[PDB]
Symmetry: none
């Protein structure tokens, strides 16, 4: 319901070689998965 | 409803590389999984 | 609703590499798994 | 009351590599597992 | 009032590699497991 | 032709789904690897 | 050296899922490192 | 000692899921590692 | 002493789940490590 | 007499689940280690 009202939080403050999934407010009741990798 | 116009703050940072998921408020009953690997 | 009239704060930061599931408030009746590996 | 006003805390500042599941407040009737491996 | 006092602070950090699965303050009725291995 | 001759080896043969990197005869020199995950 | 266009083998298959990396008898510098995971 | 001209073949047969990695010959000055995990 | 059979041979195979990490035939000055876990 | 030979020239397997990590043939100036764990 409430989400576009204000920022429930924050992430990231300037960096290199970084990735993520920013999802807040209300999650969904199901299934989720993710994978990542890097060399050197 | 679950989070009124309150404060709450979050920030992410790192050096080389970083990744993940960000979910605040109230999670639901489901399933989640993640994996990561690197070779140097 | 949990997280009654409050603020709460959290921050994450590492060097080499870091990953995880950043979630504030409280856990729920579900399942979660994570795995990571690196070669030096 | 569970938590309090102002920043509740923080996690992850500096270190080689780290991963896991972060959840404040109180844990619920669920299950969690994680594993990591590295070769020198 | 619960864990120790009102406002507080928390941060995660160490060496080599570290991982955990749980909530700060206190734990509840649940289950968790962790394993790690490496070769010198 | 050190790569044909008779039947070097064999196994199972035929499947529902498969993925990887087939490298025979010759290969590269350095470092190789990555990370992958699948559900169900 | 017996590596340039040498022999490897055969295999892989069944009726589910398979993943990995196979290279002819040619083990060079840092090679073959990573991690993988899957859930049912 | 090594595979001095004497045939060479390898085959892998699994069922549910299988993963692996390695050089079919001689492990020279290098390093290799792998990790895998699965949950019901 | 070092391989001694027609059709060379083969390696890797199982049912439920299996993992292997190591150079075939012979090995030299190197290092290898692997770890795996499952819950069910 | 060669060490526990099961890789090259043969087949690698077991029951339910199995894993292995080490140099097969002759243990020279090298090091290898592996670990695994599982729960109900």
């Amino acid at each position: 319901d409430a989400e576009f009202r204000h920022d429930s939080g924050y992430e990231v403050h300037h960096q290199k070689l970084v990735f993520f999934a920013e999802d807040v407010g209300s999650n969904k009741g199901a299934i989720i998965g993710l994978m990542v990798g890097g060399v050197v």
